[PDB]
Design a binder for this molecule. Structure first.
Ligand SMILES: O[C@@H]1CSc2nc3ccccc3n21
Ligand SMILES: O[C@@H]1CSc2nc3ccccc3n21
Ligand code: NA
Ligand code: NA
Lengths: 170, 170
């Protein structure tokens, strides 16, 4: 079932989300299924549960082909509970981000080029991966939702922030 | 004649505008007339010429009653060329701002409570005023356009940035 994606300005995007404690259950499966469905109808590459007003440490993400990032390598379809992130180097990298809770806009945002992330699949099996580049940037971005943070508070160059149909920065 | 209001992301909002040198002329009058008309149809309280892709140090502003700031005292209808601004104290004050080039959004922005501004009416007579509060905040905001600056780069508390129909911060 497709859920409403709540928009920047809602206090529910601002909360610190608690852990998921129902791994392997029917309720988590249905929620995760809703999130992939919702991500998909809105053409997202990642979606964090608080963007659907569900206060949990959960995100889904991934795709083969993105309408919005027609330049980006495939990121595996992934549902991730209780995400923890560690930078594997200090190399920062700039890239374009948008967000389904901030429709119509995009900005350039610096993120770690290399990370490891860890957590659990919805069936409870553990997940740990090294990620680089866009894959990494997705996971760091969806993680910020779980701590009540959106991309605008990460912008360093406000010349790059604007509407997607109008921007012409490189 | 109502002009297109260009949207955040256009490089033309980012420029340092040159001075107006055609005070008292027919061309400036028609431009200023267009700006009041454009401000009015979009329900603005201020409009700076670069928001209409006109690269000049010019702004119009003022109103008796605002749809968007139903709480705010009347600010006199004013067209101002070659604006210069000086804070008359260091008291900063927070208040809500939006912008016609950033439709649908608003944030809390700190501005000087007290200023003086100086420049010229379109007929060439000089203007100097002390302004406080909302009047001051309008003029400082429209001035930032003339130097290629929008309000998001002034936000200190990103919890207050969001869509106008969704926000519930105090
Ligand atoms: O603009 C898209 C739609 S959803 C999403 N999550 C993201 C994380 C990083 C970079 C881009 C995105 N986007
Ligand atoms: O949201 C409105 C529409 S235009 C404008 N210029 C401004 C300057 C300061 C505070 C608010 C505004 N606004
Ligand atoms: Na918060
Ligand atoms: Na600039």
């Amino acid at each position: 079932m497709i859920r409403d994606i709540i928009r920047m300005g809602d206090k529910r995007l601002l909360r610190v989300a608690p852990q998921v404690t129902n791994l392997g259950s029917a309720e988590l499966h249905a929620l995760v299924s809703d999130m992939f469905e919702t991500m998909g109808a809105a053409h997202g590459v990642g979606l964090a549960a608080p963007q659907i007003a569900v206060d949990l440490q959960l995100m889904v993400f991934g795709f083969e082909a993105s309408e919005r990032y027609p330049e980006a390598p495939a990121v595996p379809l992934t549902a991730l509970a209780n995400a923890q992130i560690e930078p594997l180097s200090d190399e920062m990298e700039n890239g374009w981000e948008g967000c389904l809770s901030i429709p119509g806009l995009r900005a350039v945002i610096p993120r770690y080029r290399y990370i490891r992330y860890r957590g659990f699949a919805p069936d409870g099996s553990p997940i740990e991966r090294e990620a680089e580049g866009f894959h990494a940037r997705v996971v760091q971005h969806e993680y910020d939702h779980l701590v009540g943070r959106l991309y605008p508070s990460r912008i360093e160059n406000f010349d790059t922030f604007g509407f997607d149909d109008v921007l012409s920065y490189d």
